[PDB]
């Protein structure tokens, strides 16, 4: 309760603010002050152009009595005679209060919902300290996505980090919107919240996000951090830090099961290559900076449940392979850091399958801790394996159909061929606004499985077969 003493101690203490006029050179998106006094790495500054316009920036380097500021909104129109540079005296901080939910924030965190100021309940450093591994635990229960192909076969246990790979011209954004709209726990809610930060997106996509989240009521469970494509890149790299920090605050100081999404990381990689080119660090593999591993780890590894607090957290980063190759560094590192992956096939999308997900390469390593009794029904883990095996068989059966006719195929082959088409057209195919519980998906999977004779479903345990195969 003594937090008030600390708040007042550092609260009611005003300090002056310097003001310089010694701009002494410029180089592209940089700016070079000359006679700064006691500079401070990673400060925040407010330029004042001779026309009265105002911009911002953030120092990068300091020699003996020198600073190198880089301006967010370009550098055109500045001058070395009349511009005045005002220092701040402390690094970037975010206003944090319980009542973010519902509001919409820009890249830098200034509200853009035509609403009042945040009325911060506190301030924080954007990039907090890492979690202590000794104070961390395992995922346990499940999260209901509402998507048939995900929940049934790729369940997400709270505390996991499952990316969703996708290609360039695919409807990944629509899938993300549907997921954010249909998320929730499972009751065999007063505790659920979502953070939906988007970086490097078109204007149409941003407008669609806002309009959909408005009229579908989901807004008051979320807090978006939009960042369009034409905005400064530095703000782009900043945005995910803000989103993660606010989500962490909520989860670990209000005990709310929260879910966070990013909707892109390739554009983040571009914004990152841009930096270190302002600096003179030589490019690394494929032109990317070599040290991306460290910062990407910093982004991702602020997740998982915690020992003492009842809160939790989950991440679903969305990538975009450039030319549909897993060998690219970004997907490689993401797979290295994260657990399993979710794919999106181009061919299925061509055939009008929504969500165009292929399950053969998909995987979730923490499934075994997600499904079970109480947390869900008892037959999830067996139906998952059975359906996976039968889909794999059906693909090759369809392959052989063209070469060896249809009659030479075994009865198994014909049944699998029919089941493959039925599965594709019904189970995976889900309407853009069709929400299904896990139980309904399990029932539909049972219906599909009923194609085969009871005996032949070898991989399923006899107990479950006896219990549920009826009807």
């Amino acid at each position: 309760f003594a937090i008030n003493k600390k708040a007042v101690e550092q609260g009611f203490n005003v300090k002056p603010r310097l003001n310089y006029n010694t701009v002494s050179g410029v180089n592209g998106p940089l700016v070079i002050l000359e006679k700064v006094k006691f500079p401070r790495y990673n400060e925040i500054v407010n330029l004042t152009l001779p026309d009265g316009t105002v911009r911002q920036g953030q120092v990068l380097e300091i020699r003996g009595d020198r600073a190198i500021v880089q301006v967010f909104e370009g550098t055109s129109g500045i001058d070395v005679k009349k511009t005045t540079v005002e220092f701040t005296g402390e690094s970037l901080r975010i206003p944090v209060s319980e009542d973010m939910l519902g509001r919409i924030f820009d890249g830098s965190g200034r509200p853009i919902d035509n609403g009042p100021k945040v009325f911060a309940e506190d301030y924080l450093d954007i990039n907090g300290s890492p979690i202590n591994p000794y104070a961390r635990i395992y995922p346990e229960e499940m999260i209901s996505t509402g998507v048939s192909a995900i929940d049934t076969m790729n369940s997400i246990a709270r505390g996991q980090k499952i990316p969703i790979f996708s290609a360039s011209g695919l409807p990944h954004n629509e899938i993300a919107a549907q997921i954010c709209r249909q998320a929730g726990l499972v009751r065999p809610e007063e505790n659920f919240s979502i953070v939906f930060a988007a970086m490097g997106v078109n204007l149409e996509t941003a407008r669609f996000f806002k309009q959909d989240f408005e009229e579908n009521g989901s807004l008051e469970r979320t807090s978006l951090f939009l960042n369009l494509a034409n905005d400064p890149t530095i703000e782009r790299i900043i945005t995910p830090r803000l989103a993660l920090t606010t989500a962490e605050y909520l989860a670990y100081q209000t005990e709310r099961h929260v879910l966070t999404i990013l909707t892109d990381m390739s554009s983040y990689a571009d914004a990152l290559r841009e930096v270190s080119a302002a600096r003179e660090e030589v490019p690394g593999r494929r032109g990317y900076p070599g040290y991306m591993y460290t910062d990407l780890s910093t982004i991702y590894e602020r997740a998982g449940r915690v020992e003492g607090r009842n809160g939790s957290i989950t991440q679903i980063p969305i990538l975009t392979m450039p030319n549909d190759d897993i060998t690219h560094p970004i997907p490689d590192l993401t797979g290295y850091i994260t657990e399993g992956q979710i794919f999106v096939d181009r061919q299925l999308h061509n055939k009008g399958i929504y969500p165009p997900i292929n399950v053969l390469p998909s995987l979730s390593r923490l499934m075994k801790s997600a499904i079970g009794e109480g947390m869900t029904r008892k037959d999830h883990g067996d139906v998952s394996n059975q359906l996976y095996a039968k889909y794999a068989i059906g693909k090759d059966a369809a392959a052989m159909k063209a070469v060896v006719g249809e009659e030479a195929l075994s009865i198994e082959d014909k049944l699998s061929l029919e089941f493959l088409e039925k599965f594709e057209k019904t189970f995976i195919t889900q309407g853009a606004y069709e929400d299904r519980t896990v139980f309904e998906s399990l029932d539909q999977a049972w219906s599909l499985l009923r194609i085969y004779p009871k005996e032949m479903l070898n991989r399923i345990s006899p107990k479950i077969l006896d219990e549920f195969y009826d009807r």
Partner: protein, 594 residues
């Protein structure tokens, strides 16, 4: 106030003794007053880019400041003209000098100051309060565009004091006096605007109206909504050389501005001849299309600093035209050449490439350039409504997609129309690859579709599924041979071949094939899919497709020849003909199915 030259290297020039300069001022360097603009500043020395040829310069030459970033002149007379990368008219230069060369340092007004324009005062009167972007008069420019509006430039408001009455004016007589703290406000018929700053606008909207390119593949599988981006590989034989012409002739564009960034140079002469005598038939067979189109031509040899700004000039002009509540559709020529120019500038400066020789901010600059597209509502009292639809054209860089420019463009561009090597090798002129190309406006266009043609979505999806199935089957059929195939497999294969050789293919030179209206495409699509589904149903119930094909050959030829029904005869009688053909197809299958 002048600065002495201090170092020269290629086009880069380092002046000095020049403090107080901004980041992008325009400096008229040299005794001949060559035009340039600063890039880097440190101390007093300021690196200067040069938009012309730097030969014979000597240290100690005068350097003069202007204090205003690069801008272009806006007003009446733009239409039916031609300019270079810096907005220098070409007719005027040649006529003035009678030479075939562009004399260095030659300057002329961007808009002829001699012609007299008829002006009609707007609806404002002395004492009214006015704001930037408000209309206060209209001027007739051409019979094709008789409503060239006059706009008060943004960042300017106040109370009008005096207004000129109607009559004849050249674009130099002041016709407006706005009251403020200072009465300096005096406005002629033209104004200027810095290029690199996107023009202001009240608000953006969502594009929900299609563009009719007149080509079945594009208008059917990958529709392009109005006010939307695009990418189209250039091959000179993939139809791209004529899709621009078709767009100009048919798509309802109140104004269009072709932009040639890195054209070869002879193609420039060809297209320059072609434009002045292309005709449009809309409310009278108005012969001059050039009455509805400017042109910014820049060949390779012009200085690189001009190529890097040509597209900015073009997009700014398009945005200005959008301001008046029209439907502009700009079309670039080669984004790849522009990116190459950017790389060359960066290398000259002394930067550090990070993307296979390109700078890092290339993606950011491309995003900024693209972001000005889209429908929007103007900033003015009459509540206008405009639209800008840029159609870029990336160029293959050898490898299909390894180049980073294509990756960056795909990262932002909404609609993509890839290129297929195989079809080009086989003279299948529309070489759009139906395996990689895509368009994200399909989701939204259903709102318009259902109002007029509810069946496009499902039918299109069925066709795409058919094509995908056919190609995947072809993948394996080669390794073995078409011997162990069911009737349905052969049906799908032959239907896919028929669609690919009849639906997709079309030559932009025959009268019956020049432009395919939406309704005709709809009906011809219905024909094919109905034929396929009827055949599938007939075989499913037990029959040998080999025998059936003998009877079907007649209707197969009929549907294959259906495309030859030239449009522009009834526009509705054609629909009746298609309906009769469909009914007769049903009858023939029924009787033959016996």
């Amino acid at each position: 106030e002048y600065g002495a030259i201090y170092s020269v290297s290629g086009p880069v020039v380092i002046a000095e003794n020049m403090i107080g300069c901004a980041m992008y001022e325009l400096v008229k360097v040299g005794h001949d007053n060559l035009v340039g603009e600063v890039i880097r500043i440190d101390g007093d020395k300021a690196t200067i880019q040069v938009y012309e040829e730097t030969a014979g310069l000597t240290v100690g030459d005068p350097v003069l400041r202007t204090g205003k970033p690069l801008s272009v002149e806006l007003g009446p007379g733009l239409m039916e003209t031609i300019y270079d990368g810096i907005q220098r008219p070409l007719k005027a230069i040649k006529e003035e000098s009678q030479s075939i060369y562009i004399p260095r340092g030659i300057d002329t007004p961007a808009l002829d100051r001699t012609i007299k324009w008829q002006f009609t005062p707007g609806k404002f009167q002395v004492g009214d309060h006015i704001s930037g972007g408000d209309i206060y008069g209209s001027v007739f420019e051409n019979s094709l565009i008789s409503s060239h509006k006059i706009l008060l430039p943004p960042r300017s408001r106040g109370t009008i004091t005096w207004i000129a009455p109607a009559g004849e004016y050249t674009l130099d007589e002041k016709i407006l006096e706005v009251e403020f703290d200072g009465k300096k406000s005096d406005f002629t018929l033209y104004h200027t605007w810095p290029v690199r700053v996107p023009r202001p606008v009240t608000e953006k909207l969502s594009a929900d109206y299609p563009l009719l390119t007149g080509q079945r593949v594009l208008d059917a599988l990958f529709p392009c909504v109005q006010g939307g981006t695009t990418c189209i590989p250039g091959a000179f034989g993939c139809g791209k050389t004529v899709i621009s012409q078709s767009l100009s002739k048919y798509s309802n564009s109140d104004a269009i501005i072709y932009v040639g960034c890195g054209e070869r140079g002879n193609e420039m002469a060809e297209v320059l001849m072609e434009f002045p005598e292309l005709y449009t038939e809309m409310s009278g067979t108005k012969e001059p299309i050039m009455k509805r189109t400017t042109l910014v031509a820049n060949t390779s040899n012009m200085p690189v600093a001009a190529r890097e700004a040509s597209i900015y000039t073009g997009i700014t002009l398009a945005e200005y035209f959008r301001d008046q509540g029209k439907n502009v559709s700009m079309i670039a020529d080669s984004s790849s050449r522009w990116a190459e120019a950017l790389r060359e500038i960066s290398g000259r400066l002394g930067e550090m490439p990070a993307d296979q020789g390109f700078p890092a901010y290339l993606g950011a600059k491309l995003a900024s350039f693209y972001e000005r597209a889209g429908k929007a509502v103007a900033l003015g009292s009459p509540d206008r409504t405009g639209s800008v639809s840029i159609v870029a054209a990336v160029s293959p860089a050898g490898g299909d997609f390894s180049d980073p420019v294509t990756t960056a463009t795909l990262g932002i561009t909404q609609v993509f129309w890839g290129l297929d090597k195989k079809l080009a090798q086989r003279k299948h002129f529309p070489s759009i690859n139906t395996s990689v190309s895509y368009s994200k406006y399909t989701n939204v266009l259903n709102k318009f579709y259902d109002s007029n043609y509810p069946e496009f979505p499902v039918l299109r999806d069925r066709m795409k599924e058919i094509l995908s199935n056919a190609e995947e089957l072809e993948q394996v059929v080669q390794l073995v041979g078409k011997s162990a195939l069911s009737d349905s497999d052969k049906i799908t294969l032959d239907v896919a071949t028929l669609i690919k050789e009849d639906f997709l293919q079309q030559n932009g030179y025959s009268t019956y094939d020049a432009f395919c209206p939406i309704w005709k495409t709809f009906d011809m699509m219905r024909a094919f899919i109905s034929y396929h589904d009827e055949a599938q149903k007939a075989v499913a119930n037990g029959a040998n497709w080999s025998k059936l094909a003998d009877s079907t050959g007649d209707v197969k030829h009929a549907v294959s020849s259906s495309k030859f029904f030239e449009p522009s005869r009834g526009e509705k009688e054609v629909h009746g003909e298609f309906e009769k053909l469909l009914s007769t197809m049903q009858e023939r299958f029924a009787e033959s199915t016996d």
